[PDB]
């Protein structure tokens, strides 16, 4: 059991490279509009403390440079919504996939197509955890770089690429450009909340060890849903509601195994450990699969 | 360090679907030839022990169902090369890529686009195990997904899916239908071998832990090949060759580490352990991460 993204084709038809002096980025080019991070118009002086509303007044459409491969695409307009800078171009980009975008809930997963360069490299899956961070893999010119899902050849992007935390961890904002979580498109080190764990997504893996074979970790013990919440709680574990329960209601079903009664083996897991075992290969317990992650394999 | 696939929108635009009668499995179509599994020939009762020269003599173009979605390719020809069919069929695929077929060596990582009737479900990274069998999420109906590296916008086709073993695993061919280990394309139930660790890329591994600074683990000592090999096979570990010692070249350039300085700190930890230490923040050795996949990841 292994972390599947969707496929990349309809998002990488949409990659394009934007540039302003000498900072450069990825947009998104949706029918005739580019959508990038707003700090492409900063210098390196700019970045330490951006009034992007004045830095943003001083520039005209001939200072954005967007390429899509080789074909310059002739900006017409530009606007700033939030952290996103929307570029209208002259052409439509006939590769535009049908598309929403969505605000995705802390614990849920979605694609990331890593760029540069207007150049697609690499395709991953992420979890939004519930401190608003991303573990992503990004490097010096990914931002722009997106994150999405695919349900029926509709493309649901959720993420854009803003930024790097010194723990290593990586922030962004959605396509409307709001930041998820409290960070700030500046060149300073923020800090995050307290990274807790995603409970729902932990059970559904657990379940996934099972359906693979794998159940040293199961016992006959018991437990409440408020006694395991509690327990949760004190490990730093997200709390786990009644619709978690039922979300996880079809997995259960699968392998005979209640979800209360898989509660309790992770409140063992979390109170004696893994004892140097592991789970589907993991020594630790990972907590970026969903529910349906998990369905969509097994 | 994570499991990153290449973007999959060449190999979408090649995927196709082919079937006989009632079995469909998933094609590749390349200039204006479609290559997939040969079982697709088979019913049930052919897969015990298919005579596939036999089956193929009772088919004509006209029995094959080839379909971009739900558009009908016409078949114009047929061949069997080894364990793959070829069905020449009358359109060139305007979306083929410059590609090439290659046959890759054990420890090697691909990208495997998992498709069902022709569709692509999902894009995930596989290693060749030392047994040639991969690990990969291939459910009914998975036959002809590919395996792909991509290189400067050439595609490097290097894997094509035909069958799941006992234990889970999985066994395929390269796109000239030769299959990786001794497996053969029939509905029984085959062993692999003992398998072993990838230890070019444990080493490929302890490269990028140096690169990140975390370096604990480095000794005074040095080693030769043979006498590495011969430690490493008494752990369960692949026996390094020429070319693993080539291919981590670029990485001990980079960190200034020997090959051999690095084999003699693994050979170490082989012997000792890592006595509640971590490296990369973790206790287990990973090595499903080529040099190459180091390299990405780090630049």
Redesign the interface.
Known sequence: ??????????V??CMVQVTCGTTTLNGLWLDDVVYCPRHVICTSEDMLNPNYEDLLIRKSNHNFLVQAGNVQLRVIGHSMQNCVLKLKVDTANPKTPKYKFVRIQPGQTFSV??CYNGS?????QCAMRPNFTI?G?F?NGSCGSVGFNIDYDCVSFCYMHHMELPTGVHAGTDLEGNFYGPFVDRQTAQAAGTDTTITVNVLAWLYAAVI??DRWFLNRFTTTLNDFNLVAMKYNYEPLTQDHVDILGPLSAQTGIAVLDMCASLKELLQNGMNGR?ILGS?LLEDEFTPFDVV??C
């Open positions: 059991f292994r972390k599947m993204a969707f496929p990349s084709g309809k990488e038809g197509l890593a697609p490299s690499g395709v991953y573990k893999s490097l693979n074979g592991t020594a969509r394999q």
